[PDB]
Structure formats: structure tokens, C-alpha cells
Amino acid sequence: SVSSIISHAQFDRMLLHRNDGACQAKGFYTYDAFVAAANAFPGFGATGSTDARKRDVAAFLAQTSHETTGGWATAPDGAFAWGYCFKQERGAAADYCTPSAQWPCAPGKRYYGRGPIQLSHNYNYGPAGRAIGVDLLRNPDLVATDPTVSFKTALWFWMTAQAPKPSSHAVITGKWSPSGADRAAGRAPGFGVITNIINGGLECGHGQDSRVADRIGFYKRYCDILGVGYGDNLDCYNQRPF
Numbered sequence: 681s682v683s684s685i686i687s688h689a690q691f692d693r694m695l696l697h698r699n700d701g702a703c704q705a706k707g708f709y710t711y712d713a714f715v716a717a718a719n720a721f722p723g724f725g726a727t728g729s730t731d732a733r734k735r736d737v738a739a740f741l742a743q744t745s746h747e748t749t750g751g752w753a754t755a756p757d758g759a760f761a762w763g764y765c766f767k768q769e770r771g772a773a774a775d776y777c778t779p780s781a782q783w784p785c786a787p788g789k790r791y792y793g794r795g796p797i798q799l800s801h802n803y804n805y806g807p808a809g810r811a812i813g814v815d816l817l818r819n820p821d822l823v824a825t826d827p828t829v830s831f832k833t834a835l836w837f838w839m840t841a842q843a844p845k846p847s848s849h850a851v852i853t854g855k856w857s858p859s860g861a862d863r864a865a866g867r868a869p870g871f872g873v874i875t876n877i878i879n880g881g882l883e884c885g886h887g888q889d890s891r892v893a894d895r896i897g898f899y900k901r902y903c904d905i906l907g908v909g910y911g912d913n914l915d916c917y918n919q920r921p922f
């Protein structure tokens with residue numbers, strides 16, 4: 681049904697060079713996997729006005745593109761045409777296993793970044809897996825080997841609140857009610873607060889930031905392709921982190 685908001689053609693135009701030879705995940709991310717994953721999160725791309733629905737999709741793909749970008753300044757078609765180039769945290773990484781009786785680490789497994797949102801740590805693989813009905817604590821690699829599972833973990837993140845942080849979905853579809861603390865911190869609804877939700881401690885509230893600008897670059901390019909306005913408050917340069 682999200683297919684009513686973004687066509688296969690638009691999807692490939694957005695994630696243009698993801699299957700180029702230099703991309704680690706070439707061949708992995710497919711439109712069919714995206715659509716299948718979206719079916720498990722009915723509200724995604726189907727909540728709010730047509731414009732809100734388009735932005736919900738554009739913002740999701742933009743923030744996940746940043747997490748998996750293969751872009752660079754002199755890249756063909758610009759840096760914002762290289763989202764979804766990777767599916768696993770680069771380098772030697774780490775175990776990302778912390779003591780937890782609720783989401784215990786499985787022996788020998790590592791919970792480094794995987795998929796569109798670079799899901800990390802046992803305490804995130806745990807609830808994400810439960811949400812999609814897959815044991816990701818015992819088989820975390822599925823996030824990097826099954827594209828449908830991969831996209832589902834990212835949508836789980838997109839649709840899940842971390843109170844006081846609202847879900848990114850709620851913000852972009854205009855369903856978030858900022859608190860007095862949010863208003864005092866300058867956190868107004870828009871793409872900017874979503875960046876804050878994802879990595880504000882490190883990127884927000886300290887003026888112009890290239891990481892924030894990269895996220896915005898992807899978002900504008902994707903909104904342009906779907907033909908929707910960006911909405912207001914795109915950056916978080918003056919927002920206090922959550």
C-alpha cells in the first residue's frame with residue numbers, strides 16, 4: 681500500500697547508485713523488500729494528508745540513507761544519490777553486547793550496525809526482533825542477509841517512540857504534541873527534530889553541522905522526486921538535544 685505513495689521507479693531514482701560496484705550492499709536492498717516490510721507497519725506512508733504521507737516516506741528514506749551513505753562531494757549525481765550503499769558497520773566494529781536479562785546476548789554473536797538504520801546493541805536487536813516476529817538476538821546477521829527483515833528493523837525504529845522522544849513517524853505526520861520542555865528547547869515539529877531523535881547529542885544544538893546537512897540533502901532530493909514540499913524546521917542547529 682505504501683506503493684501508492686512511492687513507485688518502484690521513484691524508489692530507484694532516489695536510491696540511484698546503491699547497486700554500483702563500489703557499494704558493499706549492492707544487490708541487497710530491493711523495492712519489493714521495502715514494500716513487504718512496509719506491510720508490517722500499516723501506518724507508515726498511510727497516515728495524514730497525501731503530503732504528510734509523502735514526507736513520511738521521504739524522511740524515512742533520507743535518515744536511513746544517511747546511515748548507509750556511500751556519497752562524497754564529487755560523486756556522480758551528487759552525494760545524495762548514494763544512500764543505501766552499505767548494510768553493515770564498516771571496520772572491525774565491536775560486540776555491542778551489554779548485560780541484559782530482558783534481551784540477553786547470544787554466545788558468539790555481535791550486535792554491530794546492520795541494515796538501513798544501522799540497528800546496534802542487543803537491547804535494540806531484542807525489541808526489534810520481537811516486533812517483527814524474528815529472533816534477532818540469536819540470529820542478528822539476518823538484519824544484513826534478509827532485505828525484508830533489514831527494512832523491517834528500520835521501520836520498527838521509525839515507528840517506535842522513546843519517550844520523551846516521540847516516534848519519527850509521529851513527528852513527520854504531524855501527530856506529535858511537543859511538551860513545555862520541548863518548546864523551551866526549541867524543538868519544533870519538522871525533519872530537524874527527527875535528526876535530534878536519532879543522534880541529537882552529537883549533531884544538534886551547536887550550529888551548522890555537516891552531518892545534519894547531509895540528512896537534509898537526502899530529504900530534499902527525495903521530497904523533490906515525490907513532488908512534495910519539505911515542511912518547516914529542517915535543521916536542529918538551535919535545538920537542545922533530548
Ligand SMILES: CC(=O)N[C@@H]1[C@@H](O)[C@H](O[C@@H]2O[C@H](CO)[C@@H](O[C@@H]3O[C@H](CO)[C@@H](O[C@@H]4O[C@H](CO)[C@@H](O)[C@H](O)[C@H]4NC(C)=O)[C@H](O)[C@H]3NC(C)=O)[C@H](O)[C@H]2NC(C)=O)[C@@H](CO)O[C@H]1O
Nearest residue numbers: 702703747748749750751752754766767768769770793798
Ligand atoms: C577525495 C575523494 O574523492 N575520495 C573519494 C571517497 O570519499 C569515496 O568514498 C566515500 O567516502 C565517504 C567519506 O568521504 C564515505 O562516507 C562514509 O560512509 C560511511 C558508510 O555509510 C558512513 O558511516 C556511517 O556513519 C554513521 C554516523 O557516524 C553511523 O551511524 C553508521 O553506522 C555508519 N554506517 C556504516 C555502514 O558504517 C560515514 O558517516 C560516511 N562519512 C561521511 C563523511 O559522510 C563513503 O561511504 C565512501 N563511498 C564509498 C562507495 O565507499 C570514494 C568512492 O569510490 O571515491 C574517492 O575518490
Ligand SMILES: [Zn+2]
Nearest residue numbers: 688689692711
Ligand atoms: Zn528496481
Ligand SMILES: [Zn+2]
Nearest residue numbers: 696697698700
Ligand atoms: Zn550507478
Ligand SMILES: [Zn+2]
Nearest residue numbers: 776777778801
Ligand atoms: Zn555501546
Ligand SMILES: [Zn+2]
Nearest residue numbers: 881882884886
Ligand atoms: Zn555538540
